[PDB]
Amino acid sequence: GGPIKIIDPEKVSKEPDALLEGFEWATLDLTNETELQELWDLLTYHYVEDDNAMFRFRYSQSFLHWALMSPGWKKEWHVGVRATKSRKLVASICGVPTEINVRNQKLKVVEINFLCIHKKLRSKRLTPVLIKEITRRCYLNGIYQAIYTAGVVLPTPVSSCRYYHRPLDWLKLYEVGFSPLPAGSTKARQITKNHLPSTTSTPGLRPMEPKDIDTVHDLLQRYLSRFALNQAFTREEVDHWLVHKPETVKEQVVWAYVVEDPETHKITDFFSFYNLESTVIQNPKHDNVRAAYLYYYATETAFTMKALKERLLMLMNDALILAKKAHFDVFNALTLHDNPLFLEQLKFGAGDGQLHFYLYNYRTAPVPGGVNEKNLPDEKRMGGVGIVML
Ligand SMILES: CCCCCCCCCCCCCC(=O)SCCNC(=O)CCNC(=O)[C@H](O)C(C)(C)COP(=O)(O)OP(=O)(O)OC[C@H]1O[C@@H](n2cnc3c(N)ncnc32)[C@H](O)[C@@H]1OP(=O)(O)O
Ligand SMILES: Cc1c(NS(=O)(=O)c2c(Cl)cc(-c3ccnc(N4CCNCC4)c3)cc2Cl)c(CC(C)C)nn1C
Numbered sequence: 001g002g003p004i005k006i007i008d009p010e011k012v013s014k015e016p017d018a019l020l021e022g023f024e025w026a027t028l029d030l031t032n033e034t035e036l037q038e039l040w041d042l043l044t045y046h047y048v049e050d051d052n053a054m055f056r057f058r059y060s061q062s063f064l065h066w067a068l069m070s071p072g073w074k075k076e077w078h079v080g081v082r083a084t085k086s087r088k089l090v091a092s093i094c095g096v097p098t099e100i101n102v103r104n105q106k107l108k109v110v111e112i113n114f115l116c117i118h119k120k121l122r123s124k125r126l127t128p129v130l131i132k133e134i135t136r137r138c139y140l141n142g143i144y145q146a147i148y149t150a151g152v153v154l155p156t157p158v159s160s161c162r163y164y165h166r167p168l169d170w171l172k173l174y175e176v177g178f179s180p181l182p183a184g185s186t187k188a189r190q191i192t193k194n195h196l197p198s199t200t201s202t203p204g205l206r207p208m209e210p211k212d213i214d215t216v217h218d219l220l221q222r223y224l225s226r227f228a229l230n231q232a233f234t235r236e237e238v239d240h241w242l243v244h245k246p247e248t249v250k251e252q253v254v255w256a257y258v259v260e261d262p263e264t265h266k267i268t269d270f271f272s273f274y275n276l277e278s279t280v281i282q283n284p285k286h287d288n289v290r291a292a293y294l295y296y297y298a299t300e301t302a303f304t305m306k307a308l309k310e311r312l313l314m315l316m317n318d319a320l321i322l323a324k325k326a327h328f329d330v331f332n333a334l335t336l337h338d339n340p341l342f343l344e345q346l347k348f349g350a351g352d353g354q355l356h357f358y359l360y361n362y363r364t365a366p367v368p369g370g371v372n373e374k375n376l377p378d379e380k381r382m383g384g385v386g387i388v389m390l
Helices: 033-046 061-068 127-139 170-176 187-193 210-224 235-242 307-325
Strands: 023-027 055-058 078-083 089-102 105-117 146-150 159-167 229-231 254-260 267-280 288-299 330-334 349-360
Touching: 023 089, 033 055, 033 061, 033 078, 033 089, 033 105, 061 089, 061 105, 061 267, 078 127, 089 127, 089 146, 105 127, 159 170, 170 187, 170 288, 210 235, 210 254, 210 267, 210 288, 235 254, 235 288, 254 307, 267 307, 288 307, 307 330
Parallel strands: 105 146, 288 330
Antiparallel strands: 023 078, 055 267, 078 089, 089 105, 089 229, 146 349, 159 330, 159 349, 254 267, 267 288
Protein backbone atom coordinates (compact mmCIF):
# COMPACT_ATOMS: atom_id res chain seq x y z
CA GLY A 1 0.00 0.00 0.00
CA GLY A 2 0.94 3.64 0.56
CA PRO A 3 -0.16 7.16 1.56
CA ILE A 4 -3.87 8.00 1.29
CA LYS A 5 -3.49 11.75 0.62
CA ILE A 6 -0.64 14.15 -0.25
CA ILE A 7 -0.52 17.29 1.89
CA ASP A 8 0.19 20.70 0.35
CA PRO A 9 2.49 22.60 2.79
CA GLU A 10 1.17 25.76 1.12
CA LYS A 11 -2.34 25.25 2.54
CA VAL A 12 -1.28 24.47 6.13
CA SER A 13 -2.63 27.26 8.37
CA LYS A 14 -0.12 29.44 10.23
CA GLU A 15 -2.54 29.84 13.15
CA PRO A 16 -4.48 27.16 15.07
CA ASP A 17 -8.27 26.71 15.05
CA ALA A 18 -10.64 28.17 17.65
CA LEU A 19 -11.09 26.43 21.01
CA LEU A 20 -14.01 26.24 23.43
CA GLU A 21 -14.85 29.56 25.10
CA GLY A 22 -12.49 30.25 28.00
CA PHE A 23 -9.76 27.91 26.72
CA GLU A 24 -6.54 28.48 24.73
CA TRP A 25 -3.75 26.44 23.11
CA ALA A 26 -0.43 25.94 24.89
CA THR A 27 2.88 24.40 23.86
CA LEU A 28 4.17 22.40 26.82
CA ASP A 29 7.86 22.88 27.62
CA LEU A 30 8.65 19.61 29.38
CA THR A 31 12.24 20.69 30.09
CA ASN A 32 10.79 22.78 32.92
CA GLU A 33 9.79 20.89 36.07
CA THR A 34 6.58 22.87 36.64
CA GLU A 35 5.18 22.04 33.19
CA LEU A 36 6.11 18.35 33.45
CA GLN A 37 4.38 18.32 36.85
CA GLU A 38 1.28 19.94 35.29
CA LEU A 39 0.98 17.16 32.72
CA TRP A 40 1.59 14.52 35.40
CA ASP A 41 -1.12 16.14 37.58
CA LEU A 42 -3.52 15.95 34.62
CA LEU A 43 -2.80 12.33 33.67
CA THR A 44 -2.65 10.89 37.22
CA TYR A 45 -6.27 11.93 37.75
CA HIS A 46 -7.65 12.01 34.19
CA TYR A 47 -5.85 9.41 32.04
CA VAL A 48 -6.77 5.86 30.96
CA GLU A 49 -9.10 4.02 33.32
CA ASP A 50 -10.68 0.58 32.90
CA ASP A 51 -14.47 0.34 32.60
CA ASN A 52 -15.09 -0.51 36.28
CA ALA A 53 -12.15 1.64 37.49
CA MET A 54 -10.91 0.64 40.02
CA PHE A 55 -7.70 1.39 38.01
CA ARG A 56 -5.96 4.33 36.31
CA PHE A 57 -2.49 4.64 34.75
CA ARG A 58 0.06 6.49 36.86
CA TYR A 59 2.82 7.26 34.36
CA SER A 60 5.70 8.63 36.43
CA GLN A 61 7.40 11.99 35.79
CA SER A 62 10.50 9.94 34.99
CA PHE A 63 8.45 7.96 32.44
CA LEU A 64 6.93 11.06 30.81
CA HIS A 65 10.41 12.59 30.46
CA TRP A 66 11.52 9.29 28.90
CA ALA A 67 8.55 8.84 26.53
CA LEU A 68 8.13 12.41 25.28
CA MET A 69 11.74 13.61 24.90
CA SER A 70 13.26 10.83 22.76
CA PRO A 71 15.68 11.42 19.80
CA GLY A 72 14.47 14.25 17.54
CA TRP A 73 11.70 15.41 19.89
CA LYS A 74 10.04 18.77 19.27
CA LYS A 75 8.24 20.73 22.00
CA GLU A 76 5.68 21.82 19.36
CA TRP A 77 4.32 18.27 19.50
CA HIS A 78 3.51 18.48 23.22
CA VAL A 79 0.12 20.18 22.86
CA GLY A 80 -1.91 21.43 25.82
CA VAL A 81 -5.09 23.36 26.49
CA ARG A 82 -5.17 25.88 29.33
CA ALA A 83 -8.06 27.55 31.11
CA THR A 84 -7.61 31.26 30.32
CA LYS A 85 -8.41 32.56 33.82
CA SER A 86 -6.72 29.90 36.02
CA ARG A 87 -3.89 28.81 33.63
CA LYS A 88 -4.59 25.17 34.62
CA LEU A 89 -3.80 22.42 32.10
CA VAL A 90 -7.11 20.84 31.11
CA ALA A 91 -6.23 18.78 28.01
CA SER A 92 -3.25 17.19 26.24
CA ILE A 93 -2.16 15.39 23.08
CA CYS A 94 1.48 14.43 22.54
CA GLY A 95 3.77 13.07 19.83
CA VAL A 96 7.37 12.05 19.16
CA PRO A 97 8.99 11.32 15.78
CA THR A 98 10.21 7.88 14.69
CA GLU A 99 10.64 5.67 11.63
CA ILE A 100 8.41 2.63 11.11
CA ASN A 101 8.54 -0.16 8.53
CA VAL A 102 5.14 -0.87 6.98
CA ARG A 103 5.65 -3.92 4.73
CA ASN A 104 9.24 -3.02 3.67
CA GLN A 105 8.39 0.65 3.00
CA LYS A 106 10.22 2.99 5.37
CA LEU A 107 8.22 5.88 6.82
CA LYS A 108 8.66 9.08 8.77
CA VAL A 109 5.84 9.12 11.33
CA VAL A 110 4.79 10.67 14.63
CA GLU A 111 3.90 8.41 17.57
CA ILE A 112 0.69 9.85 19.02
CA ASN A 113 0.20 9.23 22.74
CA PHE A 114 -1.13 10.76 25.99
CA LEU A 115 -4.45 12.00 24.60
CA CYS A 116 -6.21 13.30 27.70
CA ILE A 117 -9.21 15.51 28.45
CA HIS A 118 -10.08 16.72 31.96
CA LYS A 119 -13.12 14.83 33.30
CA LYS A 120 -15.13 18.07 33.54
CA LEU A 121 -14.61 18.80 29.83
CA ARG A 122 -15.87 15.43 28.55
CA SER A 123 -17.90 15.59 25.29
CA LYS A 124 -18.02 18.58 24.46
CA ARG A 125 -16.42 16.91 21.36
CA LEU A 126 -12.92 18.25 22.13
CA THR A 127 -10.93 15.22 20.86
CA PRO A 128 -11.23 15.94 17.09
CA VAL A 129 -10.03 19.50 17.79
CA LEU A 130 -7.01 18.10 19.67
CA ILE A 131 -6.33 15.66 16.82
CA LYS A 132 -6.53 18.38 14.13
CA GLU A 133 -4.13 20.72 15.99
CA ILE A 134 -1.29 18.23 16.57
CA THR A 135 -1.87 17.11 12.96
CA ARG A 136 -1.33 20.72 11.83
CA ARG A 137 1.85 21.11 13.94
CA CYS A 138 3.13 17.90 12.33
CA TYR A 139 2.21 19.10 8.82
CA LEU A 140 4.37 22.20 9.39
CA ASN A 141 7.38 20.04 10.26
CA GLY A 142 7.00 17.72 7.25
CA ILE A 143 5.25 14.81 8.98
CA TYR A 144 2.10 13.56 7.25
CA GLN A 145 1.81 10.05 8.70
CA ALA A 146 1.16 8.71 12.20
CA ILE A 147 1.15 5.48 14.17
CA TYR A 148 -0.95 5.27 17.32
CA THR A 149 -2.33 2.83 19.86
CA ALA A 150 -5.86 2.75 21.36
CA GLY A 151 -7.93 0.39 23.53
CA VAL A 152 -11.13 1.49 21.77
CA VAL A 153 -12.22 0.33 18.29
CA LEU A 154 -11.95 3.17 15.75
CA PRO A 155 -12.28 3.52 11.94
CA THR A 156 -10.15 0.99 9.97
CA PRO A 157 -7.69 -0.62 12.46
CA VAL A 158 -4.36 -2.08 11.28
CA SER A 159 -4.17 -4.77 13.98
CA SER A 160 -5.53 -5.97 17.32
CA CYS A 161 -3.57 -7.49 20.23
CA ARG A 162 -4.89 -8.94 23.50
CA TYR A 163 -3.40 -8.10 26.91
CA TYR A 164 -1.84 -10.91 28.95
CA HIS A 165 -0.91 -10.89 32.64
CA ARG A 166 1.54 -12.98 34.64
CA PRO A 167 0.96 -12.76 38.43
CA LEU A 168 4.17 -12.17 40.41
CA ASP A 169 2.26 -11.18 43.54
CA TRP A 170 -1.14 -12.88 43.16
CA LEU A 171 -2.57 -11.91 46.58
CA LYS A 172 -1.94 -8.24 45.73
CA LEU A 173 -3.80 -8.64 42.40
CA TYR A 174 -6.61 -10.51 44.17
CA GLU A 175 -6.96 -7.87 46.90
CA VAL A 176 -7.10 -4.95 44.41
CA GLY A 177 -9.76 -6.79 42.38
CA PHE A 178 -7.65 -7.65 39.32
CA SER A 179 -7.26 -11.43 39.69
CA PRO A 180 -10.28 -13.67 40.42
CA LEU A 181 -10.49 -17.06 42.20
CA PRO A 182 -11.16 -19.62 39.43
CA ALA A 183 -12.93 -21.69 40.32
CA GLY A 184 -13.07 -24.25 43.14
CA SER A 185 -9.61 -23.24 44.33
CA THR A 186 -8.16 -21.47 47.37
CA LYS A 187 -6.01 -18.33 47.66
CA ALA A 188 -2.93 -20.34 48.72
CA ARG A 189 -3.07 -22.73 45.73
CA GLN A 190 -3.21 -19.75 43.34
CA ILE A 191 -0.11 -18.30 45.02
CA THR A 192 1.61 -21.72 44.91
CA LYS A 193 0.75 -21.88 41.19
CA ASN A 194 2.41 -18.52 40.46
CA HIS A 195 5.58 -19.37 42.42
CA LEU A 196 8.79 -18.51 40.57
CA PRO A 197 12.39 -19.68 41.13
CA SER A 198 14.79 -17.36 42.98
CA THR A 199 17.59 -17.38 40.38
CA THR A 200 17.69 -16.88 36.60
CA SER A 201 18.44 -19.91 34.40
CA THR A 202 19.72 -18.58 31.05
CA PRO A 203 23.54 -18.91 30.95
CA GLY A 204 25.37 -15.56 30.91
CA LEU A 205 22.46 -13.29 31.84
CA ARG A 206 23.43 -9.75 32.91
CA PRO A 207 22.08 -6.17 32.75
CA MET A 208 22.70 -4.33 29.46
CA GLU A 209 25.69 -1.96 29.49
CA PRO A 210 26.14 1.02 27.09
CA LYS A 211 28.85 -1.06 25.35
CA ASP A 212 26.11 -3.39 24.07
CA ILE A 213 24.36 -0.61 22.09
CA ASP A 214 25.73 -1.31 18.57
CA THR A 215 25.33 -5.09 18.90
CA VAL A 216 21.78 -4.88 20.33
CA HIS A 217 20.86 -2.40 17.57
CA ASP A 218 21.82 -4.93 14.88
CA LEU A 219 20.20 -7.95 16.57
CA LEU A 220 16.95 -6.10 17.33
CA GLN A 221 16.57 -4.75 13.77
CA ARG A 222 17.21 -8.18 12.24
CA TYR A 223 14.55 -9.63 14.56
CA LEU A 224 12.05 -6.84 13.81
CA SER A 225 12.63 -7.45 10.08
CA ARG A 226 10.50 -10.58 10.59
CA PHE A 227 7.42 -8.42 11.28
CA ALA A 228 5.16 -6.58 8.81
CA LEU A 229 4.71 -3.55 11.07
CA ASN A 230 7.83 -2.63 13.07
CA GLN A 231 9.91 0.28 14.42
CA ALA A 232 13.02 1.14 12.39
CA PHE A 233 15.34 1.65 15.36
CA THR A 234 18.19 4.13 15.08
CA ARG A 235 21.30 3.91 17.28
CA GLU A 236 20.08 6.85 19.39
CA GLU A 237 16.67 5.19 19.76
CA VAL A 238 18.37 2.04 21.09
CA ASP A 239 20.32 4.25 23.53
CA HIS A 240 17.23 6.11 24.72
CA TRP A 241 14.60 3.35 24.75
CA LEU A 242 16.82 0.49 25.96
CA VAL A 243 19.59 1.82 28.25
CA HIS A 244 18.67 3.34 31.63
CA LYS A 245 20.78 6.33 32.66
CA PRO A 246 20.87 6.39 36.49
CA GLU A 247 22.66 9.74 36.43
CA THR A 248 20.26 11.63 35.30
CA VAL A 249 17.34 9.26 36.09
CA LYS A 250 16.47 8.95 39.80
CA GLU A 251 13.36 6.79 39.37
CA GLN A 252 14.20 3.87 37.05
CA VAL A 253 11.74 3.26 34.20
CA VAL A 254 13.39 0.85 31.74
CA TRP A 255 15.08 -2.51 32.37
CA ALA A 256 17.33 -4.33 29.89
CA TYR A 257 19.17 -7.65 30.26
CA VAL A 258 21.54 -9.33 27.78
CA VAL A 259 23.31 -12.62 26.93
CA GLU A 260 26.36 -12.75 26.45
CA ASP A 261 27.18 -16.34 25.51
CA PRO A 262 30.03 -17.83 27.66
CA GLU A 263 31.80 -19.05 24.49
CA THR A 264 31.32 -16.45 21.72
CA HIS A 265 31.54 -13.95 23.41
CA LYS A 266 29.05 -12.12 21.12
CA ILE A 267 25.52 -11.43 22.39
CA THR A 268 22.83 -13.88 21.28
CA ASP A 269 19.81 -12.69 23.28
CA PHE A 270 18.28 -9.65 24.94
CA PHE A 271 14.94 -8.74 26.52
CA SER A 272 13.43 -5.61 28.07
CA PHE A 273 10.52 -4.40 30.21
CA TYR A 274 9.32 -1.01 31.48
CA ASN A 275 7.74 0.35 34.67
CA LEU A 276 4.14 1.60 34.41
CA GLU A 277 2.18 1.98 37.66
CA SER A 278 -1.59 1.88 38.06
CA THR A 279 -3.51 3.59 40.86
CA VAL A 280 -6.22 1.69 42.70
CA ILE A 281 -9.15 4.09 43.19
CA GLN A 282 -11.27 2.49 45.96
CA ASN A 283 -8.30 2.01 48.30
CA PRO A 284 -9.25 0.03 51.44
CA LYS A 285 -6.10 -2.15 51.56
CA HIS A 286 -4.00 -1.05 48.55
CA ASP A 287 -3.81 2.19 46.56
CA ASN A 288 -1.12 1.34 43.99
CA VAL A 289 -0.26 -1.56 41.65
CA ARG A 290 3.26 -1.81 40.21
CA ALA A 291 3.12 -3.39 36.76
CA ALA A 292 5.97 -4.36 34.44
CA TYR A 293 5.33 -4.41 30.69
CA LEU A 294 7.27 -6.56 28.21
CA TYR A 295 9.02 -4.16 25.84
CA TYR A 296 11.45 -5.10 23.03
CA TYR A 297 13.38 -8.38 22.76
CA ALA A 298 15.43 -10.48 20.32
CA THR A 299 17.28 -13.82 19.95
CA GLU A 300 19.62 -15.46 17.39
CA THR A 301 17.64 -18.74 17.60
CA ALA A 302 14.75 -16.99 15.81
CA PHE A 303 16.64 -16.87 12.49
CA THR A 304 16.23 -20.60 11.78
CA MET A 305 12.28 -24.45 14.33
CA LYS A 306 10.65 -24.54 16.75
CA ALA A 307 13.63 -24.12 19.08
CA LEU A 308 12.59 -20.46 19.28
CA LYS A 309 9.66 -21.62 21.44
CA GLU A 310 12.13 -23.44 23.72
CA ARG A 311 14.48 -20.44 23.97
CA LEU A 312 11.83 -17.76 24.67
CA LEU A 313 10.31 -19.93 27.43
CA MET A 314 13.69 -19.76 29.19
CA LEU A 315 14.27 -16.03 28.59
CA MET A 316 10.78 -14.80 29.54
CA ASN A 317 10.59 -16.91 32.71
CA ASP A 318 13.93 -15.29 33.60
CA ALA A 319 12.33 -11.89 32.92
CA LEU A 320 9.51 -12.78 35.35
CA ILE A 321 12.06 -13.63 38.07
CA LEU A 322 13.96 -10.35 37.51
CA ALA A 323 10.64 -8.48 37.57
CA LYS A 324 9.71 -10.07 40.93
CA LYS A 325 13.03 -9.10 42.55
CA ALA A 326 12.50 -5.56 41.22
CA HIS A 327 9.27 -5.63 43.29
CA PHE A 328 6.75 -5.76 40.43
CA ASP A 329 3.30 -7.25 41.02
CA VAL A 330 2.31 -8.27 37.50
CA PHE A 331 4.14 -8.76 34.20
CA ASN A 332 2.05 -7.50 31.27
CA ALA A 333 2.54 -8.51 27.64
CA LEU A 334 0.60 -8.45 24.37
CA THR A 335 0.10 -11.14 21.70
CA LEU A 336 2.39 -9.15 19.36
CA HIS A 337 5.92 -10.29 18.36
CA ASP A 338 6.58 -14.01 18.96
CA ASN A 339 4.68 -13.86 22.28
CA PRO A 340 1.97 -16.47 21.46
CA LEU A 341 4.77 -19.07 21.89
CA PHE A 342 5.42 -18.61 25.61
CA LEU A 343 2.42 -16.72 27.05
CA GLU A 344 0.04 -19.53 28.06
CA GLN A 345 2.77 -21.96 29.21
CA LEU A 346 4.39 -19.31 31.45
CA LYS A 347 1.04 -18.81 33.24
CA PHE A 348 -0.01 -15.53 31.61
CA GLY A 349 -3.75 -15.03 32.19
CA ALA A 350 -5.98 -13.98 29.28
CA GLY A 351 -6.99 -10.34 29.74
CA ASP A 352 -10.16 -8.34 29.13
CA GLY A 353 -8.05 -5.53 27.67
CA GLN A 354 -7.51 -5.25 23.93
CA LEU A 355 -5.02 -2.99 22.16
CA HIS A 356 -5.59 -1.80 18.59
CA PHE A 357 -2.99 -0.37 16.22
CA TYR A 358 -3.76 2.41 13.76
CA LEU A 359 -2.09 4.42 11.02
CA TYR A 360 -2.93 7.94 9.84
CA ASN A 361 -2.76 8.77 6.11
CA TYR A 362 -1.31 5.38 5.19
CA ARG A 363 -3.33 2.57 3.65
CA THR A 364 -2.05 -0.96 4.25
CA ALA A 365 -3.47 -4.51 4.35
CA PRO A 366 -4.71 -5.85 7.72
CA VAL A 367 -1.82 -7.14 9.86
CA PRO A 368 -2.06 -10.18 12.22
CA GLY A 369 -1.95 -9.52 15.98
CA GLY A 370 -1.05 -12.95 17.36
CA VAL A 371 -4.65 -14.01 18.03
CA ASN A 372 -7.16 -16.24 16.25
CA GLU A 373 -10.88 -15.48 15.83
CA LYS A 374 -11.56 -16.68 19.40
CA ASN A 375 -9.07 -14.00 20.53
CA LEU A 376 -6.77 -16.80 21.71
CA PRO A 377 -3.00 -16.75 20.97
CA ASP A 378 -2.08 -18.38 17.66
CA GLU A 379 1.32 -19.51 16.35
CA LYS A 380 0.01 -19.08 12.78
CA ARG A 381 -1.26 -15.52 13.42
CA MET A 382 2.14 -14.00 14.28
CA GLY A 383 4.70 -12.16 12.12
CA GLY A 384 2.68 -8.94 12.05
CA VAL A 385 3.06 -6.50 14.95
CA GLY A 386 6.69 -5.72 15.81
CA ILE A 387 6.12 -2.37 17.52
CA VAL A 388 5.35 -1.80 21.21
CA MET A 389 3.72 1.56 22.00
CA LEU A 390 3.85 2.93 25.54
C1 LIG B 1 0.40 13.44 10.67
C2 LIG B 1 -0.07 13.83 12.06
C3 LIG B 1 -1.33 13.06 12.44
C4 LIG B 1 -1.38 12.81 13.94
C5 LIG B 1 -2.80 12.49 14.40
C6 LIG B 1 -3.12 11.00 14.27
C7 LIG B 1 -4.47 10.66 14.88
C8 LIG B 1 -4.29 10.14 16.30
C9 LIG B 1 -5.57 10.21 17.12
C10 LIG B 1 -5.27 10.31 18.61
C11 LIG B 1 -4.81 8.96 19.19
C12 LIG B 1 -4.36 9.08 20.64
C13 LIG B 1 -3.79 7.77 21.16
C14 LIG B 1 -3.96 7.70 22.66
O1 LIG B 1 -3.39 8.50 23.38
S1 LIG B 1 -4.94 6.52 23.33
C15 LIG B 1 -5.43 6.97 24.96
C16 LIG B 1 -6.64 7.90 24.86
N1 LIG B 1 -6.86 8.41 26.20
C17 LIG B 1 -7.57 7.90 27.20
O2 LIG B 1 -8.18 6.84 27.13
C18 LIG B 1 -7.58 8.72 28.47
C19 LIG B 1 -8.94 8.70 29.17
N2 LIG B 1 -9.91 9.27 28.24
C20 LIG B 1 -10.12 10.55 27.93
O3 LIG B 1 -9.48 11.47 28.43
C21 LIG B 1 -11.21 10.85 26.94
O4 LIG B 1 -12.26 9.88 27.10
C22 LIG B 1 -10.77 10.90 25.47
C23 LIG B 1 -9.70 11.98 25.26
C24 LIG B 1 -10.22 9.56 24.99
C25 LIG B 1 -11.96 11.26 24.60
O5 LIG B 1 -12.65 12.41 25.09
P1 LIG B 1 -14.26 12.43 25.20
O6 LIG B 1 -14.71 11.14 25.84
O7 LIG B 1 -14.71 13.74 25.79
O8 LIG B 1 -14.68 12.39 23.65
P2 LIG B 1 -14.89 13.75 22.80
O9 LIG B 1 -16.32 14.17 22.96
O10 LIG B 1 -13.77 14.71 23.12
O11 LIG B 1 -14.72 13.26 21.28
C26 LIG B 1 -15.34 12.05 20.84
C27 LIG B 1 -14.47 11.44 19.75
O12 LIG B 1 -13.22 11.01 20.29
C28 LIG B 1 -12.81 9.81 19.65
N3 LIG B 1 -12.01 8.95 20.56
C29 LIG B 1 -12.45 8.35 21.68
N4 LIG B 1 -11.43 7.65 22.24
C30 LIG B 1 -10.35 7.82 21.46
C31 LIG B 1 -9.04 7.36 21.52
N5 LIG B 1 -8.65 6.56 22.54
N6 LIG B 1 -8.16 7.72 20.55
C32 LIG B 1 -8.54 8.52 19.54
N7 LIG B 1 -9.80 8.98 19.45
C33 LIG B 1 -10.72 8.64 20.40
C34 LIG B 1 -14.10 9.11 19.21
O13 LIG B 1 -13.92 8.47 17.95
C35 LIG B 1 -15.12 10.22 19.12
O14 LIG B 1 -15.41 10.52 17.76
P3 LIG B 1 -16.82 10.08 17.13
O15 LIG B 1 -16.91 8.47 17.09
O16 LIG B 1 -18.01 10.66 18.03
O17 LIG B 1 -16.94 10.65 15.63
C1 LIG C 1 -7.25 -0.84 32.79
C2 LIG C 1 -5.98 -1.17 33.57
C3 LIG C 1 -5.43 -2.42 33.79
N1 LIG C 1 -5.88 -3.61 33.37
S1 LIG C 1 -5.35 -4.27 31.97
O1 LIG C 1 -6.24 -5.43 31.59
O2 LIG C 1 -3.95 -4.77 32.18
C4 LIG C 1 -5.41 -3.00 30.73
C5 LIG C 1 -6.63 -2.65 30.13
CL1 LIG C 1 -8.11 -3.46 30.54
C6 LIG C 1 -6.69 -1.63 29.19
C7 LIG C 1 -5.53 -0.94 28.82
C8 LIG C 1 -5.59 0.09 27.87
C9 LIG C 1 -6.81 0.65 27.49
C10 LIG C 1 -6.83 1.67 26.54
N2 LIG C 1 -5.70 2.10 25.99
C11 LIG C 1 -4.50 1.60 26.32
N3 LIG C 1 -3.33 2.11 25.70
C12 LIG C 1 -3.37 3.59 25.57
C13 LIG C 1 -2.20 4.05 24.69
N4 LIG C 1 -0.91 3.58 25.25
C14 LIG C 1 -0.88 2.12 25.50
C15 LIG C 1 -2.07 1.68 26.36
C16 LIG C 1 -4.42 0.57 27.27
C17 LIG C 1 -4.32 -1.28 29.42
C18 LIG C 1 -4.25 -2.30 30.37
CL2 LIG C 1 -2.70 -2.66 31.06
C19 LIG C 1 -4.30 -2.17 34.55
C20 LIG C 1 -3.29 -3.19 35.09
C21 LIG C 1 -3.73 -3.79 36.42
C22 LIG C 1 -2.91 -5.03 36.75
C23 LIG C 1 -3.64 -2.77 37.56
N5 LIG C 1 -4.24 -0.85 34.73
N6 LIG C 1 -5.19 -0.29 34.17
C24 LIG C 1 -5.41 1.18 34.19
